[PDB]
Design a protein around this ligand. Structure first.
Ligand SMILES: [Zn+2]
Ligand SMILES: [Zn+2]
Ligand SMILES: [Zn+2]
Ligand SMILES: [Zn+2]
Lengths: 216, 216
């Protein structure tokens, strides 16, 4: 199932009962995640800007008939933190590491909570969520999100899609450290069902291996 | 002095007395050089395809009322070797390293001469040209061109432009070695003035430092 706005700029794609992917065209798509929990809707990343983030939120709240309560920001770039203003106005908890928090205020954005640690485990009702900082890669602050109950990994901009021949913006990247960081992810999670790249189609463990090839 | 065509897809900007930069959109702009010599016109790289390449040739030949005698191909990608069939049927000598030639074949393009060695000095009438293979970077075969009379460096796709934050296609690239290869160019030419990127505005030695920054 894939719900979209009329222009198709925003879509939510179902992976399983309570796990959906959210994609918004900024014409450049960006992937995030939506989790339907007993404590409310939990998102992995916002969107390019406030309009899209506000529309996205109204979309999911309408679908699941519940309020978005928490959002996990994987890094301090527009496609991830572009809708911080909205979150705060709406009273939504914008989770992030302390580094992402400081880089956000540096990049000229409103400051997230800065509550997440290198390894943070959060249980939203029955939905178990793990955030993991693997080291520098796409950015110095990038983190990944893991769903141990489903063995699903949200790679963010640290992971490229299967057809990707590009690495994207590397001005703020640590290209040489990137490989080691992905190796850390491969080391931490031995059985992977699906991997969600920052942009593109959902894949599997291959997306990590493919991203390493691009880095060689 | 900048001259284009009725459609705007091909323009030629004068760098100096005998050196011009040719640029075509394919919708990304691609740069190459047009050298006006006492014995004909000499280009550094062709264009995205045979249609654009032929039109480019017809434009400069009409303008300088001379014939394009030689063309230097910097690597085996469409923006560089696209009009190879056009060159060969017009009797234009298509210079390239042996590696670029074999990769051209592998990529499905007609084969260039494969005559260029690591350091090849060519003189067309008055115009002096030096081709140099600095090692693997953007591709396995990329070379740079040096005009010793003007101290102008055509970095090709080995060098990113000032506003570029992306390295482009890295599927065929050797990211780790790309840094050592730019260092070889920096070490080879001690007094560089202008440097032409594969795509983007002409700059100076700072473009090489910028690209090394992106590679970090
Ligand atoms: Zn980013
Ligand atoms: Zn991204
Ligand atoms: Zn290329
Ligand atoms: Zn190029």
């Amino acid at each position: 199932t894939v719900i979209k706005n009329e222009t198709g700029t925003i879509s939510i794609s179902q992976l399983n009962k309570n796990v959906w992917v959210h994609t918004e065209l900024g014409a450049v798509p960006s992937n995030g995640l939506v989790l339907n929990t007993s404590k409310g809707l939990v998102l992995v990343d916002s969107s390019w800007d406030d309009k899209l983030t506000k529309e996205l939120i109204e979309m999911v709240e309408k679908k699941f008939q519940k309020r978005v309560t928490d959002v996990i920001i994987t890094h301090a770039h527009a496609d991830r933190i572009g809708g911080i203003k909205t979150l705060k106005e709406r009273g939504i908890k914008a989770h992030s590491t302390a580094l992402t928090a400081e880089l956000a205020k540096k990049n000229g954005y409103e400051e997230p909570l800065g509550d997440l640690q290198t390894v943070t485990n959060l249980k939203f009702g029955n939905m178990k969520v793990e955030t993991f900082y693997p080291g520098k890669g796409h950015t110095e602050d990038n983190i990944v999100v893991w769903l141990p109950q489903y063995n699903i990994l949200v790679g963010g901009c640290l992971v490229k899609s299967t057809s990707a021949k590009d690495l994207g913006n590397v001005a703020d990247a640590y290209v040489n450290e990137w490989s080691t960081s992905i190796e850390n992810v491969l080391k931490r999670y031995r059985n992977i069902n699906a991997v969600v790249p920052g942009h593109g189609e959902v894949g599997d463990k291959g997306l990590l291996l493919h991203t390493l090839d691009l880095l060689k």
